[PDB]
Amino acid sequence: GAFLDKPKMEKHNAQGQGNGLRYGLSSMQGWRVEMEDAHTAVIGLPSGLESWSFFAVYDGHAGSQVAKYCCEHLLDHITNNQDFKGSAGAPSVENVKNGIRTGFLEIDEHMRVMSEKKHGADRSGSTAVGVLISPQHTYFINCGDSRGLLCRNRKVHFFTQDHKPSNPLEKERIQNAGGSVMIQRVNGSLAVSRALGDFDYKCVHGKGPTEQLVSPEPEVHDIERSEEDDQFIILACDGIWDVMGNEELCDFVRSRLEVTDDLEKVCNEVVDTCLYKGSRDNMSVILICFPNAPKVSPEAVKKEAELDKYLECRVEEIIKGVPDLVHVMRTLASENIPSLPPGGELASKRNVIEAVYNRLNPY
Ligand SMILES: [Mn+2]
Ligand SMILES: [Mn+2]
């Protein structure tokens, strides 16, 4: 199958500020032969929603066409429908929820007609996870197995529930749509029960758009904002989540934020830590920080410098036939070094270790 001989560690970053928000993001192809993730990051929405922002991560599969179309138009499909609009003053929570549901269903059908029309040869599909942030609500949006979480008061206040085929209701639908869930896959093939695209799984005659083997229907949750307590939001594809849990990642990002305010760097650190933890998938993260996101701490920066220096000395002593990096990491791990980044652990310190190793054993 895919898998490069070596991972494409090139980071594609972006950052911005506006509407009281700050953000950074990182996308990296990793070990996969192709890059099928995509994203949207926008502060200030058109048509009278300049106070609104929108961020989303798309994990494409069997191609990037659906993911890419989604990242450039899922938003307008959401905001530009009669349900979201619901012509009145500002959109009510229901307008926003209905607007999003319709946006998903409409862009799905819309891509389907384009494909049928132009004899599209791809059979790709994509997940979508994001947040629609208004001046008073963050509406989490989920469709698939990508995941998002809101850290509030140093804790995981909310996180999206991944749509897996064996989930009771998904399984129910799948079976009623004539399919079966074999272990964790729709008919032994698809590992997600919801996604846009995957039109071959949406041909069950006698079933609605949301009653097919794979559903384009999103789960939306309205969370009232808290200026005082809202810290940050993390949106990432399963390439991240496969190897780091909710509180681990949350704890990890906090530790990195106490050390830097460069949100692109924090995202790169999450991606490399997950690659070092063994993720062999495309990886994408969007970190959106609120006014009360943790701040850089002088003592935290000190402890980091101390740890980096300490790790460099260990390598010097360990490297001494001169063991390969794989083995130096092995030694370091058996030493059970204290004060390693929470959640990220030694893997989050691999670039420091490897940089020293490289200076000492350049050939
Ligand atoms: Mn993919
Ligand atoms: Mn993935």
128 φ/ψ angles, rounded to the nearest 5 degrees = -155, 130
Q: 54: which strand partners?
A: 42, 132
Q: Rounded distance, CA 68 to CA 73, Å? A: 9
Q: Point out which residues pair with 49 in neighbouring strands.
A: 45
The closest ligand to the CA of 238 turns out to be 2
Q: Which residues are annotated as a binding site?
A: 59-60, 238, 281
Tell me the two tokens of residue 320: 């001494």
Q: What are phi and psi of 336, to 5 degrees?
A: 45, 60
Q: 229 C-alpha to center of ligand 2: Å?
A: 31
237 Cα to the center of ligand 1, angstroms: 9
Token reading at 325: 């990096």
Q: How far apart are CA 248 and CA 227, in angstroms?
A: 24
Amino acid at 261: D
165 within 8 A of 150, measured Cβ to Cβ: no
Q: Give bridge partners of residue 159 from the DSSP assignment.
A: 149
Intra-chain end-to-end CA distance of the chain, in Å: 32
CA 306 to ligand 2 centroid distance, Å: 36
Binding-site residue numbers for Mn(2+) are: 59-60, 238, 281
Burial of 28: CB neighbours in 10 Å, binned 0-12, 13-18, 19+:
buried
- The rounded distance, in Å, linking the Cα atoms of 188 and 273 is 31
Please give the distance, rounded to the nearest whole angstrom, from the Cα atom of residue 261 to the centre of ligand 1: 30
302-322 burial by CB neighbour count: b if 16+ within 10 A, else e? Answer: eebeebeeebbebbeebbeee
AA identity, residue 220: V
Tokens of 195: 């996604």
What separation in Å is there between the alpha carbon of 206 and the centre of ligand 2? 31
For residue 60, the ligand closest to its alpha carbon is 1
Take residue 261 and report the two structure tokens written for it.
């305010």
- H/E stretch holding 144 reads none
Structure tokens at 109: 């059908």
Residue of 112, 91, 131, 124 lying closest to 219 (CA atoms):
131
Ligand nearest to the CA of 34: 1
Q: Is 213 helix (H, G, I), strand (E, B) or coil?
A: coil
Phi, psi of 256 (to 5 degrees): -75, -30
Half-sphere exposure (Cβ direction) of 232: Cα atoms closer than 13 Å: 31
Crossing angle (nearest 10°) for helices 350-360 and 298-318: 40
What's the Cα-to-Cα distance from 284 to each of 34, 53, 268, 327, rounded to whole Å? Answer: 14, 19, 9, 29
How far is Cα 166 from Cα 78, in angstroms, rounded to an integer? 29
Based on DSSP, count helices (H) and strands (E) in the chain, helices before strands: 10, 15
C-beta of residue 122 within 8 angstroms of C-beta of residue 158 = no
In the reported structure, the alpha carbon of residue 196 is separated from the centroid of ligand 1 by a whole-number distance in angstroms of 13
Counting Cβ atoms within 10 Å, is residue 72 exposed (0-12), middle (13-18) or buried (19+)?
exposed
**CA atoms of 236 and 183, how far apart (whole Å):** 25
**Residue with tokens 């959640």, as numbered in its chain:** 343
Cα 234 from Cα 159, distance rounded (Å): 9
- Quick one: which of 202, 206, 229, 227 has its CA closest to 217? 202
Q: Which domains does the chain have, with CATH numbers?
A: 1-294 (3.60.40.10), 295-363 (1.10.10.430)
Q: What backbone torsions phi and psi does residue 86 show, to the nearest 5 degrees?
A: 45, 40
Q: To which residue do tokens 């009278």 refer?
A: 48
What distance in Å separates the CA atoms of residue 59 and residue 241, rounded to the nearest whole number? 12
Q: Which two three-digit tokens encode residue 100?
A: 């999003």
3 state DSSP class of 215: strand
Sign of CA dihedral 168, 169, 175, 180: negative
CA 61 – ligand 1 centroid, Å: 4
Q: Cα separation of 164 and 236, whole Å?
A: 16
Give resolution, Å, one decimal. Answer: 2.0
Tokens of 281: 């998938």
CB 66 within 8 A of CB 125: yes
Distance CA 124, CA 140 (A): 24
- The two structure tokens encoding residue 98: 């209905």
DSSP 65-119: HHHHHHHHHHHHHHHTSHHHH-SSSSPPHHHHHHHHHHHHHHHHHHHHHHHHHTT
Distance 32 CA to ligand 1 centre (A): 9
DSSP assigned state of 294 = P
Cβ(129)–Cβ(57) below 8 Å: yes
Question: What are the tokens at 227?
Answer: 């200026």
Residues with Cβ within 8 Å of 325's Cβ and at least 6 positions away in sequence, in order, are 353, 354, 357
95 CA to centre of ligand 2 in angstroms: 31
Ligand located closest to 38 CA: 1
Rounded distance from Cα 192 to ligand 1 centre (Å): 11
Q: Which two tokens stand for residue 254?
A: 């906090």
Ligand nearest to the CA of 2: 1
- Give the distance (Å) from ligand 1 centre to CA of residue 59: 5
Contact 258, 294 (CB under 8 A): yes
Spatial CA neighbour of 160 closest among 49, 237, 273, 75: 237
